[PDB]
Amino acid sequence: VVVVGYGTMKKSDLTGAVSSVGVKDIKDSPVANIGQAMQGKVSGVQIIDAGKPGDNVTIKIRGLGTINNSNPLVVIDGIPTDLGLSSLNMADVERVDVLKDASATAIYGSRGANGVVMITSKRGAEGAGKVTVNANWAIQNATKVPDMLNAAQYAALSNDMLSNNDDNTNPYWADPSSLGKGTNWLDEMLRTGVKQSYSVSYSGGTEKAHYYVSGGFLDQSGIVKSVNYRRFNFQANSDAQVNKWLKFTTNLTFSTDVKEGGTYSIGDAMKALPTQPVKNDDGSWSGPGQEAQWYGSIRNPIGTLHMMTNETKGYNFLANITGEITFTKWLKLKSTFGYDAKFWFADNFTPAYDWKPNPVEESSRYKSDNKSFTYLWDNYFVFDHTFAKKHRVGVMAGSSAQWNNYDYLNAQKNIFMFDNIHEMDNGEKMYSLGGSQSDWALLSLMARLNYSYEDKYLLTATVRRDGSSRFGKNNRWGTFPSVSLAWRVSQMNDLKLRVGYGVTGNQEIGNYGFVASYNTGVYPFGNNNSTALVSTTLSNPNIHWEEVRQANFGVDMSLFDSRVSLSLDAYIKNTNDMLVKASIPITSGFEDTTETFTNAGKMRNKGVEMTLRTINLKGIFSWESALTATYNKNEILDLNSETPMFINQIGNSYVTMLKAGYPINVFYGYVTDGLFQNWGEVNRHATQPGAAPGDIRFRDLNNDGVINDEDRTILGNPNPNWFFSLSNNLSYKGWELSVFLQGVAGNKIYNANNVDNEGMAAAYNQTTAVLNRWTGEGTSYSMPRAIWGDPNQNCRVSDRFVENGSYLRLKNITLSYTLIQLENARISFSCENVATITRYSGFDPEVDVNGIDSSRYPISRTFSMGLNFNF
Amino acid sequence: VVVVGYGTMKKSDLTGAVSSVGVKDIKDSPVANIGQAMQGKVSGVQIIDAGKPGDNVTIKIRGLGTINNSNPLVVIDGIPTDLGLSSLNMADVERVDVLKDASATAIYGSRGANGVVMITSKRGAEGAGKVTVNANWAIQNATKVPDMLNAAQYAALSNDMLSNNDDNTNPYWADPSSLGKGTNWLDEMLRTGVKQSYSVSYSGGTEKAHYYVSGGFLDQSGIVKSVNYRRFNFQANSDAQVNKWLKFTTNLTFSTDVKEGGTYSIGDAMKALPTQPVKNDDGSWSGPGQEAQWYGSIRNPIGTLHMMTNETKGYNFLANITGEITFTKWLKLKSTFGYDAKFWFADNFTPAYDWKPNPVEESSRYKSDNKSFTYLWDNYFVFDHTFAKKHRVGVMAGSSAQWNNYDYLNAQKNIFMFDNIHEMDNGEKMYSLGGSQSDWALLSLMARLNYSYEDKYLLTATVRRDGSSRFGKNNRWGTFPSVSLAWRVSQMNDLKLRVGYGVTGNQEIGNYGFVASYNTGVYPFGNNNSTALVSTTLSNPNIHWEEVRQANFGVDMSLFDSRVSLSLDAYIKNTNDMLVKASIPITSGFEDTTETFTNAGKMRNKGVEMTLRTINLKGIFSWESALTATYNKNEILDLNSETPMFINQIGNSYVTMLKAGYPINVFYGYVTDGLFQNWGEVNRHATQPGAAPGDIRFRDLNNDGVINDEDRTILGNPNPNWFFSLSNNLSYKGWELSVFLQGVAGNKIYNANNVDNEGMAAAYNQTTAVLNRWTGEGTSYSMPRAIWGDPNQNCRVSDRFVENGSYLRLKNITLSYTLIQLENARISFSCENVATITRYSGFDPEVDVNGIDSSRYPISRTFSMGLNFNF
């Protein structure tokens, strides 16, 4: 069975698009959190990894919905919470269910617009008690590392750059070959990480009672020099039947985590000169020389990493108590109470040290505290009866309530005298101090009806009325109806058609968005000053949710004597009342620069999803496979404006651009043609400031003869079009082998790291791609010359830094064998990210949503061995 | 059965002094916390109430042991914690056991020197499930309120005082009778409190599993105008038998509390003049006039109470997981892990207001955070076998470990502009900021042996080795052996004799007591200054625990066909290695003013305890009774000094005094003889500065003719000698009546409130006892005259302010009757502190340990009605 919110339903009776992940999938994954364990295992959901331990992945369902927060809703044991997925132990997760179509997400009303993720924990089973012990060890190494120049090559490049600009060169760098090799910062900054995990739990069952107690421990070290992560978990579940008409359920969760790490930056490491030794002759940390144009101004990364310490602690508590009263055979009442408390603490300390480029003469300590409490209370009725042995009617109706509180505080001191003893009482000079508070509330009413007719025609209807404090006084309440249909053709072995339609909403618009902002002012009287309030950012009492309408069609098929399955889904999603920039009339007394928003935007998404599974080979050898494909298309309809929006500034210009009729986050820049070879080509070409031979030539889109801002166009679409995956499973006498494939094609990636690593206009270490630069006529046709300051602006926004993002990756290969009194015993060996096929030149093709790569944490490759016991 | 630590034992097999409180006692108590519910119910334990909601009572076992922290040790479900008793729900407490003699407290070693309190929670029972619902409502009112003068009487007193000192009087107070009555501050400051409590729980049982889930809510309002207290509780217990040789136990506890209250003071209320109206004609708060000698300088208490707000929140988490492995039939292994986390938060805010005596022109906010985490891990073996069907041997041995961490932080800001919006971001001026950290650890080894011989001779031996980080490097480890004997004469129906002897220790000496303190200094060089450290309070690497030796004798009897019981206990307790002030030689480079301590003090305590129970009447009427008596004597042997120690300064002099050969905290002051009647008596009496007719005459202890400091002696002993109580219970056809008596006699109380309320030397409101003062020759013989400034120092430390502390109180009278499908239903009516018989003149005879009363929270009288359901 599957969970669809406020109840359970069979898979065969589902009238919407519901996808589930079983225990058999998440059983030997070497990943830490559950988020990385379901990447590519489900259709219609895109998951992007992060890499840093303790972080969470990014989940997007059926493409981007708005230009605002579009993250889905996470529900844990019926409690909608904001807890991160990295804080949940994977060893005690039963199954994960994802709701995509509006026919199933309408039950949540004002929150189920971007999809709902359901997580269910394990429970005890009837019979004798069981004890399960698990362990795992792993090592991690970086996948791909860019190649940088050595001391001699950098010296030659610097000499060429300074000679081309008619500037004095380094007196002792006239013989680059004598310098040698130098120091590699990337090799010293990276190491091999070690990950170990342990878990133990026991469970039992009885016809009237059940119990389950778990607990685990995890320790992980990052691939960089100083990052650590620890996590402790504990969970207890219970279920008792007090009498015939009473029943109780209890779920408790507790977890802690500790995060460490120094001050580091990948960009600074990639820009550190290879001619500088790590340490001086006396052991002190080195630094750049006095001449900025010869040594740069990059502070030593290793010193900052090994001298600065950052720490963070967190504590999380989750509770859930559920009751149930049985009045008659066909009537039940259910009550549920939820609790959730979180705490955060931060601690930073920067010792005072005389750094060569910029010394630090003031040691400081930073601390911060955080709290948050969330409550829930749900009450609803359950009805189920059969009429004339054919008609089945199921009606559920009730209410819900939820509110939250938040607070924080931070401070800082200085001096501290001795570095070893740096408690808060040691310092004397206070630096900063502040805090605030926020809260919100929500109320709702729900009603759902289910109908069946001879197992040949199913009809479901749902209506929900929601009211939140985030909305204005004029749009406090709203209604989100829904309806779906499903019938079977059989009553080619089976066939089923599903049609649905519903309306949902999104309320992630922040808090206190209907209140203007005032700044304190004074008005001089004859001899006294009186404080006055000046209004700014006028109130908007018409702010409400964002409307989303969706239509879905589904087909279910079974072929070859119920051996293979097929699933086809086509959806059209429309977004209305999107928040966009508003227009402020001059007669209103305010200026247009005020940041006021209104519900006027629109967006449209559509695509097709596919799923196919085959189980062909049987007998001694068992072979299974699963093919998943997904297509999506994005389009922006209106933005309530006549001018495009420019965001995501890189360098001194904006990269992305938003315009009606085009996909989101599309690039916008110049187009490169070639390289100048002589003055004759420059003279007869269109005018261009700072033109010289060996520079990049830009095309003239408009026939005006002048290269200017108007010569820009769309470069590429960061949103991919095709998502695909493939899995295989073999089994023969205990031995089993699993191979998983995953890849994404149809997107472009903007490499922002190459802006400074290929510009050759500053004292930054370059990559190996600058060796074949333009040093004369006919020497090269793609790589320009080296010049200090870049008068021609060869590093501007153009198609030079745009690369294909399509890739195919071998995700996981796992081989395990099944073996004092014991019941079960298995040993597993697995690997992650064994190989990758792509044309991208960088750390990893996996980038963020808008396709911009700028000093991201590298993705590692993991080799692990497992172990599993069972008493 | 009873719990004695790391196991259980039958009551009949106990070889030491162990007392227990059953469920039948704590079943209808209207008190909030468990501490107030066991006052006088147990012999050898003294409990003093507090009165303020959310506070904890003071517990002392068999008299004071040291001049330092002598509070006992609290153990909850085998976890030694510092959690207050007010944070525990009384509805789910099974029984409370107290260990007194050293023969039973030696198992805890370095912590069981002042007694151990054991608290056990309820657990599920085999059979069908049960549901229990409880409710209670109550009201509270002050018991006794002192009587103060009115406007006319105060005006007359002020006129007399100013005329006797030859000073100008109030021009418009020449006719006191025209003033009227005035305002009573005590009547306005006090109200009637309301207390309500609810609880609900369910439990079940199975031959292999058990469970128990509880939860409650409590709200209480104090008798003063603005004090509130709320508490939420939740607890879940489980016990499962996975297989034949495995077993697990789990206990979880969670609780929160919120405390409020303004700025108030009983002393200021009792000193406010009755001629000042509460508010002015325009509604603003009133205040004292410009003339200090006519109106005083007492700020308005009502305004401070209603304008200043203080808030405090707390969160507590307690966990306990226990395992057990059975190797053979006569061998078992047990493991236990304990967790404990606490959080505190504070919030204060004082609005700026122009108070008449001292205006406040700066509004400030104060915040504070607290954390504390404690861990435990115990592992020990259990052996039990029978030899030759007669000899029974039980051996237990193992280890233990425990450590703790602590941290805190606080800050403050000012201005805040608007009072309504006072978030931390509003303020601009930082005021203060600080924090610190502390920790400790402990390790131990344990071993206990039990022997039996034909149920006629029992021998028990126990040895424990402890090591803590609080001790010096020279006394890291120690040993605490023990031994006891017991045999039965029968093998007058039964007879049993118990003899025991053991050595325990106390380690409540603080943290980092072996580390000297340094202060930063500078030393001027030729042109620069270098920081230097100056040593102070030299290190003491010889600091260790405090040794206590105790011998106990016990007799158990049964008379009249096992109808009545009797218990006699005699104990002698000696204290060694007590921490006292040390002597610093001049050659050591330090002064005598340094606060250094060493183990040199001694103390001795002894007494007799009695217990008697009768169940005489049977049949339709059931009558039961219990008589408890206790005698104790205290004595101080040595203090490693030749001069008495003076502490507890009141006014401008010290009251208490410590000296060898005398009890602790004994008073020390002058002795009053009478009142001067004429100048002839003054002239022929011993010299006395500021002598005048109508003043108090002090006796001359030494025949020197001069009244000076040497004319002081011991006034009284605050430590009582006799503790007694009596209880009765009736039952007839559901109806039951219970009457409980309790009283303490043999102690003196020093009334520090009368120092300012009877001195008549300042602008303070006086009590009604000043009406019959000395206004002429022969007018009075006890009450002196009224004079401004008190030249004779009539309010000095003497026997004038010493009153008898003996009292007898009617504690509780409870009447309850035993009555839709239901199983049980009862309605209960109860009262608390119905009447009190005493000669003390004050709020209540219940005072602190040293017998000093100074502006304490009044003790209220409670009337309550109960209700109990059972499904």
Author numbering:
A (entry chain A), B (entry chain B): 112 to 602, 613 to 940, 948 to 999
Direct quotes from the study:
Glycan uptake across the bacterial outer membrane (OM) of these bacteria is mediated by SusCD protein complexes, comprising a membrane-embedded barrel and a lipoprotein lid, that is thought to open and close to facilitate substrate binding and transport. Here we show that for both the levan and dextran utilisation systems of Bacteroides thetaiotaomicron, the additional OM components assemble on the core SusCD transporter, forming stable glycan utilising machines which we term ‘utilisomes’. Transport-competent FOS are generated from levan by a surface-exposed lipoprotein, a GH32-family levan endo-glycanase (GHlev), while an SGBP (SGBPlev) is thought to recruit levan at the cell surface. Single particle cryogenic electron microscopy (cryoEM) structures in the absence and presence of substrate reveal concerted conformational changes that demonstrate the mechanism of substrate capture, and rationalise the role of each component in the utilisome.
Initial biochemical characterisation indicated that a utilisome existed, but cryoEM of the dextran complex revealed it to be much more aggregation prone than the levan utilisome. Despite this, initial 3D classification revealed that the SusCDdex complex is intact, (i.e. a SusC2D2 tetramer), and that the SusDdex lids are open. The positions of GHdex and SGBPdex were initially assigned by rigid-body docking of AlphaFold2-predicted models into additional density decorating the lip of SusCdex. However, unlike in the levan system, no classes corresponding to an octameric dextran utilisome existed, which we attribute to a higher propensity of the dextran utilisomes to disassemble/aggregate, potentially at the air-water interface during cryoEM grid preparation. We did observe heptameric complexes, containing two copies of the SGBPdex and a single GHdex (ED Fig. 6a-d), together with hexamers and pentamers encompassing all possible complements of GHdex and SGBPdex (ED Fig. 6e). For levan, GHlev is nearest to the hinge of SusDlev, whereas for dextran, the SGBPdex is nearest to SusDdex. Despite this variation, for two distinct Bacteroides PULs these data show that all OM components required for utilisation of a glycan are assembled into a utilisome.
